[PDB]
Amino acid sequence: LAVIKVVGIGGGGVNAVNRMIEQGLKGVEFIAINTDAQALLMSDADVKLDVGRDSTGADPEVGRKAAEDAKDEIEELLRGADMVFVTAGEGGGTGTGGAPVVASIARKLGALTVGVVTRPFSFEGKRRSNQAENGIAALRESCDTLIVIPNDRLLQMGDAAVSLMDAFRSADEVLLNGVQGITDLITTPGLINVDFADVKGIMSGAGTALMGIGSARGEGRSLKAAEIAINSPLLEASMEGAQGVLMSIAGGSDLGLFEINEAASLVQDAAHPDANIIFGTVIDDSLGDEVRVTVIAAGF
Amino acid sequence: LAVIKVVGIGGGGVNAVNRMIEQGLKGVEFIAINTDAQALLMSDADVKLDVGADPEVGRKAAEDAKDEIEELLRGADMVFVTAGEGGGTGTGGAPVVASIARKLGALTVGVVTRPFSFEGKRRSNQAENGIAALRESCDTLIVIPNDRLLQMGVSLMDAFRSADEVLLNGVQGITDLITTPGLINVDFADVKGIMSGAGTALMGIGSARGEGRSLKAAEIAINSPLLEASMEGAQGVLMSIAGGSDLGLFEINEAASLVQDAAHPDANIIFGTVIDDSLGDEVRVTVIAAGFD
Numbered sequence: 164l165a166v167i168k169v170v171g172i173g174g175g176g177v178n179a180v181n182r183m184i185e186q187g188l189k190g191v192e193f194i195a196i197n198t199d200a201q202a203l204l205m206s207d208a209d210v211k212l213d214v215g216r217d218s219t220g221a222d223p224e225v226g227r228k229a230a231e232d233a234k235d236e237i238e239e240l241l242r243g244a245d246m247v248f249v250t251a252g253e254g255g256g257t258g259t260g261g262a263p264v265v266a267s268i269a270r271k272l273g274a275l276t277v278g279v280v281t282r283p284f285s286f287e288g289k290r291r292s293n294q295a296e297n298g299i300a301a302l303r304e305s306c307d308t309l310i311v312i313p314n315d316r317l318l319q320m321g322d323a324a325v326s327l328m329d330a331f332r333s334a335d336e337v338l339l340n341g342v343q344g345i346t347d348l349i350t351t352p353g354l355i356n357v358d359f360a361d362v363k364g365i366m367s368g369a370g371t372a373l374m375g376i377g378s379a380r381g382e383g384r385s386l387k388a389a390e391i392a393i394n395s396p397l398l399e400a401s402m403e404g405a406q407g408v409l410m411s412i413a414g415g416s417d418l419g420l421f422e423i424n425e426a427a428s429l430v431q432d433a434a435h436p437d438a439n440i441i442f443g444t445v446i447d448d449s450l451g452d453e454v455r456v457t458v459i460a461a462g463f
Numbered sequence: 464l465a466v467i468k469v470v471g472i473g474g475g476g477v478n479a480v481n482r483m484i485e486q487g488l489k490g491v492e493f494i495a496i497n498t499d500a501q502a503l504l505m506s507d508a509d510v511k512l513d514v515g516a517d518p519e520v521g522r523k524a525a526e527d528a529k530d531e532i533e534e535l536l537r538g539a540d541m542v543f544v545t546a547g548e549g550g551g552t553g554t555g556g557a558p559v560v561a562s563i564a565r566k567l568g569a570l571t572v573g574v575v576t577r578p579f580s581f582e583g584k585r586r587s588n589q590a591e592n593g594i595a596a597l598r599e600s601c602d603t604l605i606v607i608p609n610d611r612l613l614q615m616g617v618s619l620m621d622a623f624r625s626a627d628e629v630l631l632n633g634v635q636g637i638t639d640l641i642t643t644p645g646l647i648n649v650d651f652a653d654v655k656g657i658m659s660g661a662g663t664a665l666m667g668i669g670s671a672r673g674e675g676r677s678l679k680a681a682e683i684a685i686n687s688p689l690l691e692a693s694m695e696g697a698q699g700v701l702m703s704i705a706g707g708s709d710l711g712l713f714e715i716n717e718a719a720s721l722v723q724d725a726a727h728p729d730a731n732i733i734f735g736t737v738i739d740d741s742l743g744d745e746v747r748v749t750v751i752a753a754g755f756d
Contacts, residue, residue, distance in 0.1 A: 166620065203505060210481070211505040216515075218501070233502040235516055236474040239549040240504075242623040273619055 165245040165359035167346055168274075170194040171208070172261045173226065175252020175281065178331075179338035180208055187449075188343050190350025191248075194240060196265065198229055198257045210240055214261070223294050226260025238268045245359060246275040246349075248342050249306065251298075252334065254283035254291035259298030266305035275363045278302045278309035279341040281334045285315055308369040308461055310341050316396035337397065341374050344411045344457030348443040353413075354420055357443025362409065365441050369407050372461035373398045380452050385412065385422035388456040389429045398460060406438050406462035413445035414454040426456060465540045465641055465651040467491040468569075469634055470560050473521060473553015476546045477504045479630055484508065488635050490642025491543075494535055496560065498524050498552035510535055514556070518589055518596075521552025525559035536564050540651065541641075543634050544601070545574040546593070548626060550585065554593035561600035570655045573601035574633040577608045579622065603658040603753055605633050605666055611688040629689065632668055636749025640703035645736030646715060657699035657731045657753065664699075664753040665690045676746045677704060681718035684748040685725045698754030700726045705737040706746035718748065727756050 169191050171180030177195045184193055184207050195208035198219045203211040215229025230237065241247055247269035251258030262278065269276040280302065283291045303309045317333050318325070325333070345366075348357045375398040377391030389412070393402045402408075412418070412426050427442045434440055447455075469491045471480030477495045484493055484507050495506035497513040498521040512535060514528040525532065536542055542564035546553030557573065564571040575594050584590065598604045612625045641651055658664075667690040669683025681704070685694050694700075702722045704715060719734045726732055739747075 166624065200503070209485075210478075213503040213505065214501065216501050216503060229501070233499075235549055235551055236499070236502055236504065239475050239478060239547075242548070243620055243627060245620050 165349055166243055167191040167246045167248070167349065168194055168241060168244040169248040169250060169342055170196060170265050171250045172196040172230070172265055173251050173255050173258025174199065174202060175255060176250045176258050177202055177206055179250050179335045181206055182335040183339045183342060184208065186339055188339065188346070191346055196237070196261065198226070212236065212240065220256060221291065221294065222256040223260035223298055226257040227264060229257065230261035230264035234264060234268060237265055238272070241269055241272060241274065244269070244272070244274045246277065248277050248279055249302070250279045250338050250342065252283065253280045253295035253298045254287060259294050262298065263301040263305040266302055270305055270307070275366060276305070276307045277345065277366060278306040279338055280309070281312045281314045281338065283314055284330065303371055308366040308372045310372045310374050310459060312337050312341065312374060312397055313399065316399070319396040337376070340376050340457060344374070344376070345409065345459065347413060347445040347447065348411050351446055353418065353444030353446040355423060355442060355444040357441055361441055365407055365409050365439065369461040372459050373401060375402065375458040375460070376455070378453055378455045384454045385426040386429055388412070388454045389426035392456040392458045393430060393433045398458070401463060402433055402458070402460055403435055404463045405460035406435055407460070408434060408438050408440040409459045410440065410442050411445055411457045412442070412454060413447045413450060415448045415450050416446060418444070418454060422454070430458065466538055467541045467543070467638055467642065468494055468536060468539045469543045470494045470496060471545055471547060472496040472556045472560055473498045473546045473551045474502070474504045475549045475551065476553045476557070477506050479545055479547035480508055481506055482627060482631055483634060486631065488638065491638050496532070496556065498556040516551045518550070518552065518555030518593060521555030522559055524552065525556035529559065529563060532560055533563050533567065536567055536569065539564065539567070539569040541572065542569040543572045543574060545630070547630060548576055550590060550593065554589065557593070558596040558600040561597060565600060565602065570658055571600070571602045572637070572658060573597040573604040574630065575604060575606050576626065576630060577606065577610070579609045598663065603661040603664050605664045605751065607633055607666060607689065608691065611691065614688040629668065632749060633666055636666070636668070636703050637701065637751060639705060639737045640701065640735050643737045645738050646710065646712060647735045649733050649735040653733050654701070657701065657733055661699055661753040664751050665693050667694070667750040667752070669748045670745055672744050676744065677710065677714040677718040678721060680704070680746045680748040681721050684750045685722060687750070690750065690752055693752050694725050696727055696754070696756040697730055697752035698727055699731045701733045701751040703735055703737055703749045704746055705739045706742055707740055707744070708738050710736065710746065722750065
């Protein structure tokens with residue numbers, strides 16, 4: 164029985180964790196770390212740590228020092244995890260600076276450490292983009308796998324009429340998608356059980372990763388969800404280059420092995436010839452007649 | 464109705480208290496004291512005091528807040544104090560809280576962990592220094608030597624989880640014995656009798672299922688590596704058997720007979736049971752051993 168902890172650090176990561184909790188992500192402990200007590204009070208995370216209380220403006224150096232100052236405390240919170248997700252919206256101060264500290268503690272402990280972060284929208288400005296770039300470089304060194312979701316690509320999905328608030332909610336959602344796509348394999352396996360050991364096998368030291376998500380209903384749903392996922396703007400047309408692929412297909416109790424296999428076959432055909440691809444399923448009865456495919460691609 | 468307050472101090476202590484709450488430890492009041500200026504671990508504890516990695520810093524912070532801590536502890540018959548796992552300012556603050564509790568007349572029980580040897584060691588022997596300081600301020604100090612967890616039943620993640628679980632048992636095995644009805648109940652006065660000024664105590668735990676479960680769980684607890692073979696010499700022993708409502712008097716009594724055989728002839732022994740109908744056919748025994756021959 165694998166113990167999974169999902170840490171949201173900084174406002175963006177805390178918002179993502181809140182969304183996970185709201186959407187009913189099970190089987191994981193949620194840890195919120197931020198430099199803002201009021202946001203933490205509003206969060207229903209299991210564990211809430213307010214850091215940099217004396218020291219505290221989007222300065223990653225402030226965020227790094229706040230996390231480093233609290234390193235013993237973070238360590239004590241994470242000890243015992245088999246797997247730790249570190250989630251943040253890169254570009255700010257607390258997430259950008261603090262995420263690599265959290266990941267490094269998780270990696271030192273030997274937990275399978277998976278970062279899941281967004282790169283900011285280009286409209287957020289060049290300083291945020293530059294901070295995100297450096298925070299991503301730092302986090303990459305600290306994680307087994309770091310899934311980076313380019314927020315710019317989210318705007319090529321969903322609605323052309325989206326508001327600013329919708330866009331950021333969609334960023335929270337994709338972070339949830341990235342975590343859940345992996346954790347649900349472990350916590351709520353369907354017909355094809357991909358357990359913690361298998362996940363560890365493919366995600367350990369995998370380095371930078373991208374994610375694609377697809378969903379569909381009715382006839383040909385599993386093939387359609389898979390095709391959407393492998394062509395996802397979030398994957399940056401880089402699916403064919405990935406040497407390591409984890410695919411999760413989720414559906415209700417009635418999702419058949421034939422459909423699962425058809426999606427798997429489509430993904431194999433799309434993959435790099437030498438790719439190691441693990442296929443897993445998830446039972447989620449709340450999905451009704453929807454099937455959801457998530458692909459995590461690494462090793463380019 | 465013994466008033467029992469459980470004080471977690473510093474991040475590790477607050478975290479321990481948060482686990483106790485999450486697990487539904489009953490019959491006690493939880494107090495979370497934060498001792499760090501720079502960070503605050505939040506808590507659903509009844510009572511929270513923010514007085515904020517140096518033991519000296521935590522000591523000073525608690526001493527600065529002595530009046531407020533005193534008011535929080537007033538009226539307790541029993542106070543548990545723990546800085547939980549990992550050190551920090553909590554290790555400085557714990558002895559101050561304990562000293563206040565004891566000066567108020569509460570039976571004051573510290574709970575302290577010795578880190579695993581693989582964790583290494585931070586200067587000025589601060590971990591043993593924390594233990595010595597807490598021991599001077601407590602009636603009884605339950606010391607949990609984490610190294611011994613590796614002899615029980617171990618992976619790194621299992622080791623840390625086992626440590627958290629046993630720390631929780633450090634409090635719950637005793638408080639449930641006092642607060643939660645079982646077939647065999649105890650008098651708080653007898654608990655106070657064996658724990659008052661007792662000094663260092665060790666704990667043992669055992670679980671078993673099926674026929675002979677009570678005797679089997681008790682044998683495991685009394686032989687627990689956590690007791691460091693101290694059972695033979697202990698002059699004060701507390702034993703609690705948790706299990707279903709259907710645990711029979713005969714099987715309970717077999718366990719009580721075992722502990723008397725195993726304890727020093729001159730030992731005071733407090734023995735009781737706890738109904739926990741959620742355990743199924745499992746029984747869980749906790750033994751606390753204090754004193755020497």
